[PDB]
Short mmCIF file of C-alpha atoms and ligand atoms in Angstrom, two decimals:
data_model
loop_
_atom_site.label_atom_id
_atom_site.label_comp_id
_atom_site.label_asym_id
_atom_site.label_seq_id
_atom_site.Cartn_x
_atom_site.Cartn_y
_atom_site.Cartn_z
CA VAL A 1 0.01 -0.02 0.01
CA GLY A 2 0.83 3.67 -0.24
CA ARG A 3 2.33 3.82 -3.76
CA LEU A 4 1.84 6.65 -6.22
CA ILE A 5 2.39 7.19 -9.95
CA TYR A 6 4.93 10.03 -10.28
CA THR A 7 5.19 12.11 -13.48
CA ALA A 8 8.26 14.26 -13.95
CA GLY A 9 8.95 16.91 -16.56
CA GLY A 10 7.42 16.93 -20.00
CA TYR A 11 6.61 19.42 -22.70
CA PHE A 12 3.89 21.94 -23.43
CA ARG A 13 5.10 24.96 -25.42
CA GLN A 14 8.43 24.51 -23.59
CA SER A 15 9.99 21.82 -21.38
CA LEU A 16 8.48 21.56 -17.94
CA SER A 17 9.79 21.17 -14.38
CA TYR A 18 6.64 19.68 -12.86
CA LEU A 19 6.73 16.73 -10.50
CA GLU A 20 3.19 15.48 -9.77
CA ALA A 21 1.98 12.25 -8.20
CA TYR A 22 -1.29 10.43 -8.75
CA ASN A 23 -2.85 8.16 -6.15
CA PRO A 24 -4.96 5.44 -7.86
CA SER A 25 -6.59 4.61 -4.55
CA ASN A 26 -8.36 7.98 -4.24
CA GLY A 27 -8.00 9.83 -7.57
CA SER A 28 -5.91 12.66 -6.06
CA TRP A 29 -2.97 14.48 -7.58
CA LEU A 30 -0.22 16.15 -5.56
CA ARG A 31 2.19 18.74 -6.88
CA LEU A 32 5.65 18.11 -5.48
CA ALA A 33 9.08 19.74 -5.68
CA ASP A 34 9.94 20.98 -9.20
CA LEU A 35 12.86 19.50 -11.03
CA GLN A 36 15.93 21.73 -10.78
CA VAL A 37 16.07 21.99 -14.60
CA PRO A 38 13.03 21.70 -16.90
CA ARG A 39 13.22 18.68 -19.16
CA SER A 40 11.20 16.79 -21.77
CA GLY A 41 12.18 13.50 -23.36
CA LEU A 42 13.52 12.16 -20.12
CA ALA A 43 12.76 8.82 -18.45
CA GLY A 44 11.96 8.00 -14.83
CA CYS A 45 12.71 4.94 -12.74
CA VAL A 46 12.93 3.95 -9.09
CA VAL A 47 15.63 2.19 -7.16
CA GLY A 48 15.57 1.71 -3.40
CA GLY A 49 12.43 3.82 -3.08
CA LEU A 50 14.12 6.84 -4.69
CA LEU A 51 12.85 8.35 -7.95
CA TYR A 52 15.40 9.08 -10.66
CA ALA A 53 15.01 11.48 -13.60
CA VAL A 54 17.40 10.61 -16.43
CA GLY A 55 18.40 12.62 -19.50
CA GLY A 56 16.04 14.65 -21.65
CA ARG A 57 16.35 18.11 -23.11
CA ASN A 58 15.51 21.60 -21.85
CA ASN A 59 13.55 23.29 -24.64
CA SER A 60 13.30 26.89 -23.48
CA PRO A 61 13.25 30.40 -24.96
CA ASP A 62 16.95 30.75 -24.06
CA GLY A 63 17.88 27.63 -26.01
CA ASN A 64 17.64 23.86 -26.37
CA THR A 65 20.07 21.90 -24.19
CA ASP A 66 20.30 18.07 -24.21
CA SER A 67 20.73 16.62 -20.72
CA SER A 68 23.30 14.21 -19.38
CA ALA A 69 21.80 14.65 -15.94
CA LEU A 70 20.76 12.07 -13.37
CA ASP A 71 18.73 13.57 -10.49
CA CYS A 72 17.26 11.77 -7.50
CA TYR A 73 14.03 12.63 -5.69
CA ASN A 74 13.49 11.36 -2.16
CA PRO A 75 9.76 11.23 -1.22
CA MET A 76 10.69 11.34 2.47
CA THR A 77 12.18 14.85 2.09
CA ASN A 78 10.39 16.16 -1.02
CA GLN A 79 13.84 17.18 -2.33
CA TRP A 80 15.78 16.62 -5.52
CA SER A 81 19.54 15.93 -5.35
CA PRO A 82 21.98 15.73 -8.26
CA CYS A 83 23.76 12.46 -8.96
CA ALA A 84 26.68 11.72 -11.24
CA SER A 85 26.03 12.71 -14.85
CA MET A 86 26.07 10.28 -17.76
CA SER A 87 28.95 10.13 -20.26
CA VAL A 88 26.87 11.96 -22.92
CA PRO A 89 23.64 13.94 -23.22
CA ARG A 90 20.66 11.75 -24.06
CA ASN A 91 17.35 13.28 -25.16
CA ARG A 92 14.45 10.98 -26.05
CA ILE A 93 16.06 8.34 -23.88
CA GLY A 94 14.84 5.01 -22.53
CA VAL A 95 15.82 3.49 -19.19
CA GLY A 96 15.45 0.21 -17.37
CA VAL A 97 16.55 -1.18 -13.99
CA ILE A 98 18.24 -4.55 -13.51
CA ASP A 99 19.18 -5.67 -9.97
CA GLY A 100 19.41 -2.16 -8.61
CA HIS A 101 21.30 -0.68 -11.55
CA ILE A 102 19.97 1.97 -13.99
CA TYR A 103 20.58 1.40 -17.67
CA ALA A 104 20.44 4.49 -19.88
CA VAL A 105 19.78 3.53 -23.50
CA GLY A 106 20.18 5.44 -26.74
CA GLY A 107 18.73 8.90 -27.20
CA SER A 108 19.99 11.90 -29.12
CA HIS A 109 22.53 14.69 -28.74
CA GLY A 110 21.91 17.27 -31.42
CA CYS A 111 21.93 15.38 -34.68
CA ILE A 112 23.75 12.41 -33.09
CA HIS A 113 21.61 9.28 -32.66
CA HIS A 114 23.15 7.08 -30.01
CA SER A 115 23.59 3.33 -29.98
CA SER A 116 25.57 3.62 -26.73
CA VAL A 117 24.29 2.32 -23.39
CA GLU A 118 25.59 3.02 -19.90
CA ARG A 119 24.89 1.61 -16.43
CA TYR A 120 24.60 3.49 -13.13
CA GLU A 121 25.58 2.06 -9.73
CA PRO A 122 23.69 3.99 -7.00
CA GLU A 123 25.89 2.70 -4.17
CA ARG A 124 29.05 4.07 -5.85
CA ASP A 125 27.38 7.01 -7.67
CA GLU A 126 29.12 6.06 -10.90
CA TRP A 127 28.19 5.43 -14.51
CA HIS A 128 30.04 3.09 -16.81
CA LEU A 129 29.47 2.33 -20.51
CA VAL A 130 28.39 -1.20 -21.47
CA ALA A 131 28.05 -2.78 -24.90
CA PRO A 132 26.23 -0.51 -27.39
CA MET A 133 23.02 -1.63 -29.12
CA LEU A 134 23.15 -3.10 -32.60
CA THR A 135 21.08 -0.11 -33.81
CA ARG A 136 21.10 3.60 -33.13
CA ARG A 137 17.82 4.45 -31.46
CA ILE A 138 16.22 7.64 -30.22
CA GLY A 139 12.70 7.67 -28.85
CA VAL A 140 13.48 4.10 -27.81
CA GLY A 141 11.16 2.13 -25.52
CA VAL A 142 12.95 0.20 -22.79
CA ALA A 143 11.78 -2.40 -20.34
CA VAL A 144 13.18 -5.20 -18.15
CA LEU A 145 11.74 -8.66 -17.78
CA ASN A 146 13.45 -11.58 -16.03
CA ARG A 147 16.69 -9.59 -15.66
CA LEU A 148 16.95 -9.02 -19.42
CA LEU A 149 16.84 -5.49 -20.95
CA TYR A 150 14.78 -4.77 -24.08
CA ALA A 151 15.13 -1.83 -26.44
CA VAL A 152 12.11 -1.44 -28.71
CA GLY A 153 11.53 0.70 -31.80
CA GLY A 154 12.68 4.28 -32.08
CA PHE A 155 14.31 6.32 -34.86
CA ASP A 156 17.83 5.70 -36.15
CA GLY A 157 18.33 9.05 -37.90
CA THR A 158 16.74 7.92 -41.15
CA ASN A 159 13.98 5.36 -40.47
CA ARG A 160 11.43 4.83 -37.75
CA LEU A 161 11.87 1.30 -36.52
CA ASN A 162 9.84 -1.84 -35.89
CA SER A 163 12.97 -3.66 -34.75
CA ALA A 164 13.79 -4.58 -31.18
CA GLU A 165 16.77 -6.10 -29.34
CA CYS A 166 17.65 -7.63 -25.98
CA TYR A 167 20.68 -7.18 -23.74
CA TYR A 168 21.99 -10.21 -21.82
CA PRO A 169 24.00 -8.76 -18.95
CA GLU A 170 26.14 -11.79 -18.15
CA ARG A 171 27.45 -11.74 -21.75
CA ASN A 172 27.45 -7.94 -22.15
CA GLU A 173 25.80 -8.57 -25.50
CA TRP A 174 22.81 -7.40 -27.52
CA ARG A 175 20.82 -9.65 -29.85
CA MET A 176 17.91 -8.84 -32.16
CA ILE A 177 14.51 -10.20 -31.21
CA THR A 178 11.45 -10.62 -33.42
CA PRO A 179 10.43 -7.20 -34.80
CA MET A 180 7.13 -5.65 -33.87
CA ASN A 181 4.27 -5.71 -36.32
CA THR A 182 4.21 -1.89 -36.33
CA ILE A 183 6.86 0.78 -36.75
CA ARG A 184 6.90 2.79 -33.55
CA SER A 185 9.05 5.71 -32.39
CA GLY A 186 8.32 7.53 -29.17
CA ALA A 187 6.07 4.74 -27.93
CA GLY A 188 5.49 3.70 -24.35
CA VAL A 189 7.12 0.39 -23.44
CA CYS A 190 6.66 -1.51 -20.20
CA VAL A 191 6.48 -5.02 -18.77
CA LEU A 192 3.36 -6.74 -17.50
CA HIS A 193 3.33 -10.43 -16.56
CA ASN A 194 5.54 -12.31 -19.09
CA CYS A 195 5.25 -9.74 -21.94
CA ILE A 196 6.86 -6.52 -23.13
CA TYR A 197 4.11 -4.08 -24.21
CA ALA A 198 4.58 -1.35 -26.81
CA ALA A 199 1.80 1.21 -26.83
CA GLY A 200 1.31 4.09 -29.22
CA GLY A 201 4.16 5.97 -30.85
CA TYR A 202 4.71 7.62 -34.19
CA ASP A 203 5.21 5.56 -37.36
CA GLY A 204 6.53 8.37 -39.57
CA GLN A 205 3.01 9.38 -40.69
CA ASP A 206 0.60 9.11 -37.80
CA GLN A 207 0.42 8.90 -34.04
CA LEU A 208 -0.77 5.43 -33.01
CA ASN A 209 -3.34 4.01 -30.67
CA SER A 210 -2.45 0.36 -31.29
CA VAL A 211 -0.77 -1.74 -28.63
CA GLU A 212 1.17 -4.96 -29.06
CA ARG A 213 2.93 -7.31 -26.67
CA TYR A 214 5.96 -9.54 -27.00
CA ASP A 215 5.83 -12.89 -25.20
CA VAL A 216 9.41 -13.60 -24.22
CA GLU A 217 8.85 -17.37 -24.33
CA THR A 218 7.09 -17.66 -27.71
CA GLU A 219 8.97 -14.76 -29.34
CA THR A 220 5.79 -13.41 -30.96
CA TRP A 221 4.15 -9.99 -30.94
CA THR A 222 0.36 -9.90 -30.57
CA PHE A 223 -1.96 -6.90 -30.73
CA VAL A 224 -4.17 -6.26 -27.70
CA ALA A 225 -7.03 -3.75 -27.43
CA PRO A 226 -6.02 -0.29 -28.76
CA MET A 227 -5.97 2.75 -26.56
CA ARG A 228 -8.82 5.22 -26.75
CA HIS A 229 -6.40 7.96 -27.80
CA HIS A 230 -3.62 7.97 -30.37
CA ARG A 231 -0.48 9.15 -28.67
CA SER A 232 3.22 9.68 -29.23
CA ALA A 233 5.70 10.68 -26.49
CA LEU A 234 3.49 9.13 -23.82
CA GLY A 235 4.51 8.18 -20.31
CA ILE A 236 3.86 4.62 -19.22
CA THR A 237 4.12 2.52 -16.06
CA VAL A 238 2.60 -0.53 -14.41
CA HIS A 239 0.87 -0.54 -11.04
CA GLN A 240 -1.04 -3.36 -9.37
CA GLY A 241 -1.30 -5.42 -12.53
CA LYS A 242 -2.48 -2.68 -14.88
CA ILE A 243 -0.76 -0.41 -17.40
CA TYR A 244 -1.14 3.33 -17.09
CA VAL A 245 -0.42 5.66 -20.02
CA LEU A 246 -0.05 9.37 -19.35
CA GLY A 247 -0.36 12.26 -21.78
CA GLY A 248 1.42 12.44 -25.12
CA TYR A 249 0.59 14.13 -28.38
CA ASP A 250 -2.25 12.98 -30.66
CA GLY A 251 -1.48 15.17 -33.64
CA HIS A 252 -3.74 17.96 -32.41
CA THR A 253 -3.55 18.26 -28.64
CA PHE A 254 -1.05 17.66 -25.87
CA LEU A 255 -3.19 15.20 -23.96
CA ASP A 256 -4.07 15.30 -20.29
CA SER A 257 -5.72 11.88 -20.62
CA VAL A 258 -4.53 8.96 -18.45
CA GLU A 259 -5.76 5.56 -19.63
CA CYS A 260 -5.49 2.25 -17.76
CA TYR A 261 -5.27 -1.21 -19.36
CA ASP A 262 -6.72 -4.19 -17.60
CA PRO A 263 -5.15 -7.38 -19.07
CA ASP A 264 -7.85 -9.68 -17.66
CA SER A 265 -10.61 -7.97 -19.65
CA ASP A 266 -8.36 -6.69 -22.48
CA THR A 267 -9.87 -3.22 -22.09
CA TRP A 268 -8.70 0.33 -21.61
CA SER A 269 -10.52 2.95 -19.55
CA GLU A 270 -9.92 6.61 -18.78
CA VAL A 271 -9.03 6.83 -15.09
CA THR A 272 -7.93 10.45 -14.50
CA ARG A 273 -6.62 13.53 -16.19
CA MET A 274 -3.28 15.13 -15.51
CA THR A 275 -3.51 18.70 -14.24
CA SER A 276 -2.47 19.93 -17.70
CA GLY A 277 -1.80 18.33 -21.06
CA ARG A 278 1.83 17.47 -21.81
CA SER A 279 4.06 15.02 -23.66
CA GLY A 280 7.47 13.58 -23.10
CA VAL A 281 7.22 12.90 -19.36
CA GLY A 282 9.14 10.45 -17.24
CA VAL A 283 7.04 8.14 -15.05
CA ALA A 284 7.69 5.71 -12.21
CA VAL A 285 6.01 4.28 -9.07
CA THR A 286 7.17 4.59 -5.48
CA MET A 287 5.90 5.36 -2.02
CA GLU A 288 3.93 8.52 -1.27
CA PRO A 289 5.97 11.47 0.10
O1 QH5 B 301 8.88 17.60 -26.38
S1 QH5 B 301 8.38 16.29 -26.75
O2 QH5 B 301 7.71 15.71 -25.60
N1 QH5 B 301 9.70 15.32 -27.17
C1 QH5 B 301 9.78 13.85 -27.22
C2 QH5 B 301 9.67 13.08 -26.04
C3 QH5 B 301 9.80 11.68 -26.07
C4 QH5 B 301 9.97 10.97 -27.29
C5 QH5 B 301 10.04 11.76 -28.49
N2 QH5 B 301 10.32 11.20 -29.82
N3 QH5 B 301 11.38 10.36 -29.97
C6 QH5 B 301 11.47 10.06 -31.30
C7 QH5 B 301 10.38 10.74 -32.01
C8 QH5 B 301 10.15 10.66 -33.41
N4 QH5 B 301 10.50 9.60 -34.23
N5 QH5 B 301 10.16 9.92 -35.49
N6 QH5 B 301 9.67 11.23 -35.50
N7 QH5 B 301 9.69 11.70 -34.23
C9 QH5 B 301 9.72 11.47 -31.02
C10 QH5 B 301 8.52 12.28 -31.12
C11 QH5 B 301 7.25 11.87 -31.91
C12 QH5 B 301 7.18 11.99 -30.35
C13 QH5 B 301 9.95 13.18 -28.44
C14 QH5 B 301 7.14 16.42 -28.15
C15 QH5 B 301 6.35 15.37 -28.59
C16 QH5 B 301 5.40 15.45 -29.64
C17 QH5 B 301 5.20 16.69 -30.26
C18 QH5 B 301 5.96 17.82 -29.87
C19 QH5 B 301 6.92 17.66 -28.82
#
């Protein structure tokens, strides 16, 4: 009990510093301490009950600055603290956690599209590079299942991608997996039960509402019910056996919609609205502050 869905940063007109937390048990939102630097295109994750904001870009009137930053929010104090920075700025990043370590995957720095990957050790406050992906990927969806790290879709600088790959830590090696049925860049990717879900994204022409899942045993991708709203640059997380998608861009509006997927019924429902529409947030779940 006592866990909230935290949304950090995002974009509406400019990059945002908001940190807000939604309580599924009572529908409430809390506004918490702002990020030190506004950022969109970041990712969130949690290790040891602390929330981390990783990478992104500050789109502002004074300029556009890609972020190498790692910042840590402690719900007990409602304070952000800087951590060691990554080796390189990474906007439109994906992150995943394996055994207490944060993997930062891909992303962009100006016109550079990264294949590089680095791993953070909270106990030592150090980053180190690991093997790079087989493909350069920005807007990459990342998730961890059974202590394996998946990188899904994205944009390589020329093509939006349906391809996906998996990192096997004990071999420090990436291998391609079955490609998705749909090209998706800037999708939401998460794990639920024994599958990697990819929701929404942009296929080069349209924002998507379709959702597909990769069963890691059978190596197949299967479509599930589509979301009510097409969305790119959505936030995504899992909480108590359901997927939550937050915001994004539908080609017309920066959405405030939050939808929730129930895998038992294979249905999506609208569960709340963010306090304002935005895209490009980072999202994770930890204890209330
Ligand atoms: O400020 S945003 O939130 N930035 C952002 C954040 C997270 C991921 C991505 N992302 N990553 C690769 C691509 C991409 N692939 N092919 N074309 N585009 C994108 C874009 C399409 C969503 C972008 C922002 C979003 C939508 C409209 C205006 C601003």
